[PDB]
Scaffold this active site. Structure first.
Site, PDB file in Angstrom:
ATOM      1  N   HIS C 113      43.690  42.829  41.183  1.00 36.41           N
ATOM      2  CA  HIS C 113      44.024  44.106  40.567  1.00 36.41           C
ATOM      3  C   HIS C 113      43.772  45.291  41.480  1.00 36.41           C
ATOM      4  CE1 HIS C 113      44.378  41.797  36.899  1.00 36.41           C
ATOM      5  NE2 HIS C 113      44.850  42.869  36.293  1.00 36.41           N
ATOM      6  N   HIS C 236      38.394  34.726  39.163  1.00 34.07           N
ATOM      7  CA  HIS C 236      39.699  35.288  38.846  1.00 34.07           C
ATOM      8  C   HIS C 236      40.116  35.078  37.393  1.00 34.07           C
ATOM      9  CE1 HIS C 236      43.708  36.623  39.207  1.00 34.07           C
ATOM     10  NE2 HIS C 236      44.274  35.498  39.599  1.00 34.07           N
TER      11      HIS C 236
HETATM   12 MN   LIG Z   1      42.596  37.404  33.595  1.00 36.04          MN
HETATM   13 MN   LIG Z   2      41.777  38.520  38.782  1.00 35.40          MN
END
Ligand SMILES: [Mn+2]
Ligand SMILES: [Mn+2]
Lengths: 69, 322, 290, 176, 275, 580
Positions: C113, C236
């Site tokens: 992100h 993650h």
């Molecule tokens: Mn996620």
């Molecule tokens: Mn991630």
């Protein structure tokens, strides 16, 4: 053989020598009044399933996916 | 502020006592009205507020916006440029064409330079810059003749002829240095322009103009090395160029004491000598051994390994070698 | 000239954001610091390893209440400090302020992100506009994100990393050779590094997400054995128990964002490492809100 | 009512890496994923059952037969391992045996009563393999031969294992 | 110069709960390796080995100066075994240099070569020994290409403003271009730009090494080009016959790099004259 | 052509993307500053009325900007001309425009004169409600309220009757809007006019076919019930309250259940005691847990505000028989809502009654599965201790406390630590030492750092109470045992407790037991330990004897200031400078 279900708390032969004293302390405490978290990855981010097995709260008054839509 | 608050304000430019504001004016005026003319007049006024310093306009304002700015200036005052001439013109339309052609030469020089590629709108700017650079490459000679003819003229917000000549002559020498990579005879003109710039800068010491002294010094050093018309580096260079190698050996033996020359330079001249003996000239064989021995002592004193050239030169050792 | 940083840390601890110039100076200092950092940032034990935070600032303060204040507890953050949360700006600013102030005592890696496209779509950009009115704060932070290390190495044994492995990468020296100062691509080593997910698989696999790969136990076993690692700490994916071992305890997925998009009801966890590399996981529920 | 049988080569030659860094088996599984991604685009393809067969021994060859849900097919595809020989003929025989298993009990194959195009059980076998030569415990067979040691009952009436409505396609992965 | 009881104490350290839920790996990592060796002793061990190799390579030992001719067959033997030792080839091993984008597909192999060169400093010494016989350096082109790709990757990924912060990579780039020049895989004009590498930033030295790659693609380090000139008994490469033997575009990018940094590369401007 | 400010600049600025539209909208102040006041007041407002294609991005900002116009319009006399375009803006289908517009219009009423608003505002309400769109009527009722303090009776009557028309409309959302504005309007209208007009409308909207209007009638119940306290009230709010108490609308029962306290205080104790206690009794046993949890918050305040004449009688006769069902309920949220407030009845109910009745309920909720219920039980045990005394509290509830001192949740353990100095403030050294001192020492090695720092303060309070003569005997050697642990956070706890205890222990006491342990940790390989040692010496610096300071503390701080980690360097330098 992996996933043979080790019985470390039920079988002392499964205990490694290097991990003997700490495991001994753990299962000593566990036997008293006072492995886990190894779920398959597929059923690991299941929030529909987790919320289904949880109580309801009070009611109100580029890429492809990134989880939780 | 913004383009509208500045458009209604007839004194906002008189209050902030900029280049981002100028590119904002041009960006709003990028599309083709009276608001456009007012924006161009304000941009020209605030550009002229900086005393027309291309050394600050070039770095911030990109090539196409500055191209549009001085094209608008030439439309404002003037009216090819080479065929027109008329250097005995009014001041404003003199320095306008002067600054525009100095900008032309400066961006040709800058475009020749290598920039850092951006690892991470851009396409339109790239196409426009490529097109204007292409037409500039087409008409660079006209700009060179215009600036050269202007430098010969000293008729005259009037500016001093000394600074107005030193800046432009520096630009001529930079342009010739750009073409010197292709035609080596062009360097002679660059040498003369650079010496004139150094003499003028040492003479008046004007500030507005301001020149990078280190760049001028390096330019003069490069021209001195390239076209002859001293430090041991240049001494080795002229000795190699003139075919004299004994002084190279002596200055290398002295360099072993001073540790002045780069080791890379010594290895390269040793390789060049080996290549020339390789090509012919049996008289070079002792010269190759001599400079190889000199580099070897330089290496051992610096704590570096003995080369293969030294080791193979000491196969079949001889009394004179030792 | 460091008392203002402590005042900013104190100010951010009350969920009060900094101004645009404050964020600007913070980002210049952080960029200066992070430029020195290698892609595989070696981290000395003891250290506490945390997973995704994803904007939940009050959950990040809960994490601090669990593991200790930031100068006193060495922290490792494996990416995803933004998006899917109401206070992305506050949490990312606090993490960057701690990195600036205590550069040896906290490490912040890059997650998937931390990219311009993902921040634009999933709402870090929108939060920046709401809290500042201009995207210059978002531009500052996204330009700062390119400088974050991709991975971390704890005592040369544990290999903290946001996403997973790549078929194009077999050794840590490839990761060290990456030019990480760029946008996270849609393919290649860095993309799979920040996007990959382990699975009960055979070899590699095309990910359900549009980026990265998905890898099985044999892949991570070969990676651990080749690179002399014992574990691949990972952050993650979403985890319900807070942490979850994968691939015969070669890969562990630590998630540190309890009740992830304020709706999953997931529990969070942080893995503490101490002087003997002994791991203990502290699961923590979300902090009590209104 | 289509059937999509995948005869995934699981010979150890499928462990050859392509330039992508993934083995041929990895691209084979990915090609199956891409195939169902493309097939699911057609909204008349919703009703469709996938099967899976590999090159393993007969008890372990079939990994998704009849009455096995799509989740089991996915899980079995993901966990395949390339560890056998290139017993392509035996795997083809067991693939056709899987498909023609139910033909007699429901009598789609009308023997002696004419061939009915309107009575069919459509299916295609996609065998993703490599170009590597066939292998058995004895040696290299160098030619595709279909074993006939243990015929299914009624196999003498067709003279060929492959049926009317069954077609075979091959994805011979030649990725260098 | 190459690079590189339980339960009793555990009981004593115990407190009625384990606290830690496990131990990652075998506990703490070791204190790593330690090195202590004299540099001058390394220099002279290398000297004895290289002298032996030069004795073996040269023909058995007229003019009272000069040196014997190193055998290109012997140096070819050294080059091929150097290739085999450092990187067992056949991923890309044709003498033709592939496009620069192909270096992004062999990056693991190039990093392996780079580590081997970094760990074992005498690989450069044997490289110069190979370069001493001209046509033999062509057969070691895989190592040159791999090391060049590793160095290009480093310079592209260098956030430093000067090459002085990458001492080994700076020295390796200088040595690599010097070795190509000595082996006449580059013309003298292109082979002189290891002088300026200490002065530049990473991006221009990356550009110059890409110009090395482009020149080697355009001309090609092949042994057939090295014609046997029998006036002395050794091979010669003359780039002028090959067309654009000065390396026109590559000289152009080098001169642009010089003109950018003319404030400090003024004195070096004489090392890159095309005539 | 394009030099004209308003159209040429603003339209071509609004033709760009969204963020530039927001910016150019925000710069509409500047276009008013640049021009003279007469030109803007005569021209600018029409183009705000025109080109209505601005999208939802800029309408709230434009409304706010029109709100802040107070001098650039011309003055208080001409500020009424901001009524039309803002009103036309209020006809937008999305919601935030309406409240933002009425907020802006209310603000500029400060510059408005009676005559001015009689001439424009009241006709604006007339034409606004008359509009064929529900948005106009919602904005009409929203803008309705701010006319009463400035208008006279003649048009007060018009306002009142037009509001009466607004109650009896047919489209639903205007009914919801007018119902919301009843409660805000109920606080300003004359009581006689309220009786004449609003009560029939409030009553028949309390029986509206839409549950939302009943909900907002419940909202306006308090604002219509805080006044009119004669027999009026007895025949005013009664029908709607008794209908809404057990109404079929679950939401109405919810929002009544969250508001009983303010209503009960506003209408006297005895009256609620007489009338709404069947409603209160049956509400606690309702079908759904939503209203059940909502009402259970209001036990403490409802009991405390009640009449002392029969407070215990009414509480034991009506609240406890249903509290028994509430405690054993299957819903965790209902019990959590219960536990937070029902334990405050221990002063109200007395001592003997508490021991006889409340204590089994407290123990039942202490064994509750949901940890939130347990935490809420522990929340205010100080009141129970004050009204019961240390004796019965230690007799009955103490084993539950021992059980929850090692609970799964860290918040419960944190709550338990907070009352440990309180209980130890009223307990004997011997019993406390054998029972809980080891338990207090068990918390300094807890995983959570909140628990650790929680009971560090607890130890400080205990030493402040007991004294060094006991801290040396018990607290200190087991702390020093924790000082040698390999886990660095245990060494952190050693340094933190050394910091907190030194303030209240003794200068010689610190210098001869605390100091050598701190001298040991200066050589620790963990930079956290070393900088924490530097900070600890800084903190305990002005406490211990000054002779030992430069004798022992100074050389290590000279060593720590040359530590390789910059953090320890900074902290050691700061400690050196401030020690002086
Ligand atoms: Mn996620
Ligand atoms: Mn991630």
């Amino acid at each position: 053989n992996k996933d043979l279900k080790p019985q470390t708390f039920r079988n002392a032969y499964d205990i490694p020598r290097r991990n003997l004293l700490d495991h001994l302390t753990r299962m000593r405490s566990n036997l008293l009044k006072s492995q886990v978290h190894s779920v398959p990855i597929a059923q690991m981010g299941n929030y529909q399933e987790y919320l289904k097995q949880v109580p309801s709260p009070l009611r109100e008054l580029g890429m492809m996916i990134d989880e939780a839509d | 502020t913004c383009w509208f608050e500045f458009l209604l304000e007839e004194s906002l430019l008189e209050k902030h006592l900029p280049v981002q504001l100028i590119v904002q004016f041009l960006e709003q005026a990028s599309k083709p009205n009276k608001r456009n003319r007012i924006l161009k007049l304000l941009a020209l006024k605030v550009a002229a507020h900086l005393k027309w310093d291309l050394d600050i306009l070039e770095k911030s304002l990109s090539v196409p916006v500055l191209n549009m700015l001085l094209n608008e200036l030439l439309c404002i005052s003037k009216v090819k440029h080479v065929d027109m001439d008329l250097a005995t013109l009014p001041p404003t339309t003199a320095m306008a064409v002067l600054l525009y052609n100095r900008w032309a030469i400066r961006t040709i020089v800058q475009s020749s330079f290598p920039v850092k590629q951006a690892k991470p709108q851009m396409q339109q700017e790239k196409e426009l810059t490529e097109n204007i650079l292409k037409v500039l490459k087409e008409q660079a000679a006209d700009s060179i003749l215009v600036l050269e003819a202007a430098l010969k003229l000293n008729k005259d917000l009037k500016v001093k002829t000394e600074e107005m000549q030193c800046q432009v002559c520096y630009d001529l020498g930079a342009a010739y240095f750009q073409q010197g990579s292709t035609n080596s005879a062009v360097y002679e003109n660059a040498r003369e322009k650079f010496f004139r710039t150094k003499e003028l800068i040492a003479e008046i010491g004007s500030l507005s103009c301001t020149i990078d002294e280190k760049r001028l010094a390096g330019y003069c050093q490069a021209c001195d090395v390239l076209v002859p018309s001293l430090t041991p580096y240049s001494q080795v260079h002229i000795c190699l160029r003139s075919g004299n190698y004994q002084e190279v050996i002596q200055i290398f033996i002295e360099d072993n004491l001073t540790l002045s020359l780069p080791v890379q330079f010594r290895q390269s001249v040793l390789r060049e000598l080996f290549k020339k003996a390789q090509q012919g000239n049996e008289a070079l064989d002792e010269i190759c051994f001599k400079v190889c021995a000199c580099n070897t002592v330089r290496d051992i004193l610096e704590g570096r390994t003995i080369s293969v050239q030294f080791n193979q030169l000491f196969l079949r050792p001889n009394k004179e070698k030792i | 000239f460091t008392k203002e940083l402590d005042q900013w840390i104190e100010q951010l601890n009350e969920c009060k954001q900094l101004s645009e110039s404050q964020v600007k100076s913070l980002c210049e200092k952080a960029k200066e610091i992070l430029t020195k950092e290698s892609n595989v940032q070696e981290v000395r034990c003891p250290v506490t390893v945390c997973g995704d935070v994803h904007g939940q600032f009050h959950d990040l303060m809960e994490l601090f209440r669990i593991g200790g204040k930031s100068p006193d507890t060495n922290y490792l953050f494996m990416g995803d400090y933004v998006n899917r949360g109401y206070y992305s700006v506050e949490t990312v600013t606090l993490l960057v302020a701690l990195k600036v102030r205590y550069r040896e005592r906290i490490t912040i890696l890059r997650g998937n992100h931390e990219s311009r496209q993902i921040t634009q779509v999933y709402g870090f950009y929108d939060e920046c506009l709401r809290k500042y009115g201009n995207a210059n704060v978002w531009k500052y932070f996204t330009d700062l994100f390119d400088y974050l290390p991709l991975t971390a190495l704890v005592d040369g044994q544990i290999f903290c990393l946001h996403g997973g492995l790549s078929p194009s990468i077999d050794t840590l020296d490839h990761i060290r050779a990456l030019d990480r100062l760029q946008e996270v691509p849609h393919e290649g080593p860095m993309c799979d590094l920040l996007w990959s997910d382990p699975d009960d698989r055979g070899g590699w696999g095309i990910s359900p997400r549009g980026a990265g790969y998905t890898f099985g136990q044999d892949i991570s076993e070969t990676f651990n054995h080749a690179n002399g690692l014992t574990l691949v700490s990972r952050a993650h994916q979403l985890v319900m128990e807070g942490y979850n071992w994968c691939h015969d305890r070669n890969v562990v997925t630590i998630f540190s964002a309890p009740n992830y998009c304020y709706r999953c009801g997931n529990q969070a966890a942080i893995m503490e490492l101490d002087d003997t590399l002994k791991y203990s996981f502290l699961q923590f529920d979300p902090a009590p809100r209104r | 009512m289509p059937i999509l049988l995948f005869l995934i080569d699981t010979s150890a030659s499928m462990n050859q890496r392509s330039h992508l860094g993934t083995t041929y088996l990895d691209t084979a599984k990915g090609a199956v994923e891409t195939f169902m991604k493309l097939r699911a685009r057609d909204p008349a393809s919703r009703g469709d059952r996938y099967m899976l067969v590999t090159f393993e021994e007969p008890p372990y060859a079939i990994k998704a037969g009849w009455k096995e849900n799509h989740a089991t097919f996915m899980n079995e595809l993901k966990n395949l391992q390339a560890e056998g020989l290139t017993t392509l003929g035996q795997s083809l025989r067991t693939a056709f045996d899987l498909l023609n298993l139910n033909r007699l009990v429901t009598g789609i194959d009308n023997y002696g009563q004419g061939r009915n195009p309107f009575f069919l059980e459509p299916a295609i076998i996609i065998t993703i393999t490599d170009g590597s030569k066939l292998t058995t415990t004895s040696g290299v067979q160098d030619e595709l031969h279909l074993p006939l040691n243990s015929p299914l009952p009624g196999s003498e009436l067709t003279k060929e294992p492959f049926r009317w409505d069954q077609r075979l396609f091959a994805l011979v992965l030649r990725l260098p | 110069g190459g690079q590189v009881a339980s339960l009793l104490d555990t009981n004593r350290r115990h407190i009625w709960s384990v606290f830690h839920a496990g131990v990652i790996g075998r506990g703490l990592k070791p204190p790593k390796f330690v090195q202590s060796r004299n540099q001058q002793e390394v220099i002279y061990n290398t000297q004895s080995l290289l002298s032996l190799l030069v004795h073996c390579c040269s023909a058995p030992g007229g003019e009272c100066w000069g040196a014997p001719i190193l055998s290109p067959e012997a140096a070819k033997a050294v080059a091929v075994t150097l290739v085999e030792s450092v990187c067992p080839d056949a991923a890309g091993a044709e003498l033709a240099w592939p496009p620069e984008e192909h270096a992004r597909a062999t990056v693991e192999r190039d990093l392996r070569i780079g580590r081997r060169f970094r760990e074992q400093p005498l690989l450069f010494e044997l490289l110069k020994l190979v370069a001493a016989a001209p046509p033999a350096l062509c057969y070691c082109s895989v190592l040159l290409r791999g090391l060049l790709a590793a160095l290009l990757g480093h310079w592209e990924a260098s956030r430093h403003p000067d090459t002085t912060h990458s001492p080994w990579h700076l020295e390796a780039s200088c040595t690599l271009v010097a070795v190509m020049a000595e082996g006449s895989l580059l013309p003298p004009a292109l082979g002189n730009m290891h002088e300026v590498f200490s002065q530049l930033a990473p991006f221009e030295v990356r550009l110059l090494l890409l110009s090395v790659w482009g020149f080697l693609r355009e001309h090609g380090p092949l042994p057939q080009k090295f014609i046997f000139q029998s006036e002395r008994g050794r091979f010669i490469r003359d780039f002028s016959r090959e067309g654009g033997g000065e390396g026109g575009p590559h000289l152009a990018v080098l001169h642009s790099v010089l003109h950018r940094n003319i404030d400090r590369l003024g004195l070096f401007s004489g090392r890159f004259q095309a005539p | 052509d394009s030099l004209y400010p308003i159209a040429v600049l603003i339209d071509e600025l609004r033709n760009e993307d969204v963020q530039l539209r927001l910016n150019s909208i925000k710069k509409l102040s500047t276009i008013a500053l640049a021009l003279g006041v007469e030109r803007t007041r005569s021209e600018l407002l029409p183009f705000l009325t025109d080109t209505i294609y601005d999208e939802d991005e800029v309408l709230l900002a434009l409304a706010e900007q029109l709100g802040t116009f107070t001098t650039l319009v011309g003055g208080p006399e001409y500020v009424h001309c901001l009524l039309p375009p803002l009103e036309s803006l209020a006809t937008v289908e999305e919601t935030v425009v309406r409240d933002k517009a009425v907020e802006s219009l209310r603000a500029i009423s400060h510059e408005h004169s009676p005559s001015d608003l009689e001439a424009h505002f009241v006709p604006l309400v007339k034409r606004l409600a008359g509009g064929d769109w529900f948005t106009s009527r919602t904005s009409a009722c929203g803008l309705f309220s701010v006319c009463y303090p400035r208008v006279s009776s003649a048009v007060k009557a018009e306002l009142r009757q037009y509001f009466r028309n607004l109650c009896s409309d047919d489209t639903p959302m205007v009914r919801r809007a007018a119902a919301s504005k009843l409660g805000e309007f109920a606080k300003v209208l004359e009581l006689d006019n309220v009786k004449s007009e609003i009560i029939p409308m409030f009553s028949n909207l309390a029986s509206d076919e839409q549950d939302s209007v009943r909900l907002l009638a419940v909202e306006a119940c308090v604002n219509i019930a805080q006044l009119l306290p004669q027999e009026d009230l007895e025949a005013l709010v009664m029908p709607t309250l008794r209908q809404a108490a057990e109404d079929k609308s679950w939401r109405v029962r919810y929002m009544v259940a969250d508001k009983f306290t303010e209503l009960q205080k506003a209408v006297g104790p005895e009256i609620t005691k007489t009338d709404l206690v069947p409603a209160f009794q049956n509400l606690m046993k309702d079908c759904e847990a939503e209203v059940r949890a909502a009402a259970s918050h209001k036990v403490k305040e409802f009991c405390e505000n009640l009449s002392a004449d029969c407070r215990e009688n009414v509480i034991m006769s009506q609240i406890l028989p249903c509290i028994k069902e509430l405690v054993s309920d299957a819903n965790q949220h209902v019990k959590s809502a219960l536990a937070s407030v029902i334990m405050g009845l221990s002063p109200i109910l007395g001592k003997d009654n508490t021991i006889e009745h409340l204590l089994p309920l407290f123990l039942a909720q202490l064994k509750d599965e949901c940890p939130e219920v347990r935490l809420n039980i522990i929340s205010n045990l100080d009141c129970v201790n004050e009204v019961i005394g240390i004796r019965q509290l230690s007799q009955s509830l103490l084993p539950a406390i021992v059980e929850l001192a090692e609970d799964a949740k860290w918040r419960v353990r944190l709550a338990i630590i907070e009352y440990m100095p309180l209980l130890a403030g009223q307990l004997g050294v011997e019993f406390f030492d054998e029972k809980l001192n080891s338990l207090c020492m068990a918390w300094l090695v807890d995983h959570v750092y909140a628990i650790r720092e929680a009971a560090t303060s607890n130890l400080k309070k205990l030493v402040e109470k007991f004294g060094k003569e006991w801290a040396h005997a018990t607290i200190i050697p087991k702390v020093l045992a924790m000082s040698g642990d390999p886990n660095y956070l245990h060494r952190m706890t050693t340094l933190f407790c050394i910091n907190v205890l030194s303030e209240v222990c003794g200068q010689d006491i610190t210098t001869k037991h605390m100091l050598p342990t701190v001298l040991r940790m200066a050589g620790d390989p963990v930079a956290n330990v070393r900088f924490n040692v530097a900070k600890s010496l800084q903190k305990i610096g002005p406490i211990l004897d000054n002779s030992t300071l430069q004798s022992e503390v100074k050389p290590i701080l000279e060593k720590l200031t040359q530590d390789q980690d910059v953090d320890v360097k900074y902290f050691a330098q700061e400690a050196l400078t401030v020690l002086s």
